[PDB]
Amino acid sequence: ERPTFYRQELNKTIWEVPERYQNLSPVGGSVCAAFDTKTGLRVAVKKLSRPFQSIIHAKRTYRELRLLKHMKHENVIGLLDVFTPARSLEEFNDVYLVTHLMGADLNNIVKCQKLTDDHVQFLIYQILRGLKYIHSADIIHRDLKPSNLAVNEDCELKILDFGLARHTDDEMTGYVATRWYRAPEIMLNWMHYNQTVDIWSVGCIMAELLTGRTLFPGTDHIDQLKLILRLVGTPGAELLKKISSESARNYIQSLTQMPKMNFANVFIGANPLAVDLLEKMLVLDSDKRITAAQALAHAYFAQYHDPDDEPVADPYDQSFESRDLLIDEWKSLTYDEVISFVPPP
Ligand SMILES: Cc1ccc(O)cc1Nc1ccnc2cc(-c3csc(C=O)n3)ccc12
């Protein structure tokens, strides 16, 4: 049956939710913390803002719901519930997404406690386990950074935030964490990117866990490229060919050639195995970076690697991405997905 819903205003916005969700408290679409009386879980309830305002917004709402509906993995955000107060398609205008409530993110950790090498092993292991799963479905996160890695008191980690609105040019400008973890090829639009961009971000994140400092805190895209090439060396002829942008290729060739630095001297005191893994992640040529599946088998993770407990994902059909639909068609597809949702056990 349809649950009974109740309404409340929570600063400037109307929330209409099933009775099971109690004690809604704004924390961040808008997000409310709540108590799920049915499961006994503390939950986050996100009310999507203006979900079908334009074609681009209706498609993004569909995308985020598709992605969240698919993720069933211990180290990736999962959907506990999705609902609408609407009783039919004709009256459908609001989408609410429910997930486990997350206390802290990796920023809260890296910043407010010292991480042993064993903590770095555990945290990075879990990121790579979630990424093996995400990548096996041909999903690219594209925006891995400490603020979208939730971490509980047992150091257990989930990857959050996919299907999100693409960052504006302004949001990627200047001295900003929104860009510090991005692979160079996507930061500078060197070429068609793929899932290897996520591995670059893990390397940036792992080095920050080890040193307590951002690896590439560029003050703008160019300063950041310079920080990156200082560590990993300027590109060779082979990588230059793969840079399809004539302009970017030409700029990068204006730079004084530099060799790759010795990472043992950059990451002083680090476990030599961590150093080795960082060298295999932070390779400029994305073709040559270690994959998530490969990294799980790296000796740095000996204590955690269990090849029988590193699952892959069911197939994920994203043919919708290439489809051109009207707002109401994207909105009808989303409604189908709300209506057919089945909670996890
Ligand atoms: C609801 C949702 C759905 C999808 C997604 O990718 C992210 C979210 N947002 C969140 C999920 C889980 N926990 C969250 C926790 C917060 C939050 C911000 S301060 C705080 C303190 O309790 N909690 C904000 C958003 C969250």
For residue 45, the ligand 1 atom closest to its alpha carbon is 1
Q: What is the dihedral of CA 249, 254, 260, 263, to 10 degrees?
A: -100
C-beta of 33 in contact with ligand 1 (< 6 A)? yes
The 3-state secondary structure of the chain, one letter per residue: CCCCEEEEEECCEEEEEECCEEEEEECCCEEEEEEECCCCEEEEEEECCCCCCCHHHHHHHHHHHHHHHHCCCCCECCCCEEECCCCCCCCCCCCEEEEECCCEEHHHHHHHCCCCHHHHHHHHHHHHHHHHHHHHCCCCCCCCCHHHEEECCCCCEEECCCCCCCCCCHHHCCCCHHHHCCCHHHHCCCCCCCCHHHHHHHHHHHHHHHHCCCCCCCCCHHHHHHHHHHHHCCCCHHHHHHCCCHHHHHHHCCCCCCCCCCHHHHCCCCCHHHHHHHHHHCCCCHHHCCCHHHHHCCHHHCCCCCCCCCCCCCCCCCHHHHCCCCHHHHHHHHHHHHHCCCCCC
Mutate to test the pocket of ligand 1, among 63, 65, 67, 101 (most ligand atoms within 8 A of CB): 101
Report how far residue 24's alpha carbon sits from residue 10's, in angstroms, rounded to the nearest whole number: 8
Radius of gyration of the chain measured on its C-alpha atoms: 22
Report how far residue 3's alpha carbon sits from residue 345's, in angstroms, rounded to the nearest whole number: 18
Domain ranges of the chain: 15-103, 104-312
Pick from 161, 190, 200, 198: nearest CA to 76? 161
Report how far residue 47's alpha carbon sits from residue 84's, in angstroms, rounded to the nearest whole number: 10
The data reach a resolution, in angstroms, of 1.8
Q: Please report, as a single letter, which amino acid is at residue 45.
A: V
Q: How much distance in Å is there from the Cα of 78 to the middle of ligand 1?
A: 12
Pick from 144, 147, 100, 146: nearest CA to 120? 146
Task: Give, in order, the Cα–Cα distances in Å from 298 to each of 14, 141, 233.
Answer: 50, 22, 24
Residue 46 marked in a binding site = yes
Q: Which of 161, 223, 276, 285 is catalytic?
A: 161
Q: How much distance in Å is there from the Cα of 68 to the middle of ligand 1?
A: 13
Pick from 197, 179, 188: nearest CA to 287? 197
Class of domain 15-103: alpha beta
C-beta of 205 in contact with ligand 1 (< 6 A)? no
Residue 31 marked in a binding site = yes
Residue 44, beta-bridge partner list: 33, 99
Residue 30 marked in a binding site = yes
C-beta of 164 in contact with ligand 1 (< 6 A)? no
Report how far residue 213's alpha carbon sits from residue 258's, in angstroms, rounded to the nearest whole number: 23
Mutate to test the pocket of ligand 1, among 102, 141, 152 (most ligand atoms within 8 A of CB): 102
The CATH number of the structural domain formed by 104-312 is: 1.10.510.10
Angle made by CA atoms 136, 138, 141, in degrees to the nearest 5: 100
The whole-angstrom distance between residue 20's C-alpha and the CA centroid of its chain comes to: 29
169 belongs to the catalytic site: no
Pick from 228, 232, 208, 209: nearest CA to 218? 228
Neighbours of 269 (CB within 10 A): 9
With contact defined as beta carbons under 8 Å apart, do 289 and 278 qualify? no
Q: How much distance in Å is there from the Cα of 150 to the middle of ligand 1?
A: 9
With contact defined as beta carbons under 8 Å apart, do 322 and 229 qualify? no
Report how far residue 48's alpha carbon sits from residue 68's, in angstroms, rounded to the nearest whole number: 14
Q: How much distance in Å is there from the Cα of 102 to the middle of ligand 1?
A: 6
C-beta of 99 in contact with ligand 1 (< 6 A)? yes
Report how far residue 122's alpha carbon sits from residue 67's, in angstroms, rounded to the nearest whole number: 26
Report how far residue 277's alpha carbon sits from residue 299's, in angstroms, rounded to the nearest whole number: 9
C-beta of 161 in contact with ligand 1 (< 6 A)? yes
C-beta of 148 in contact with ligand 1 (< 6 A)? no
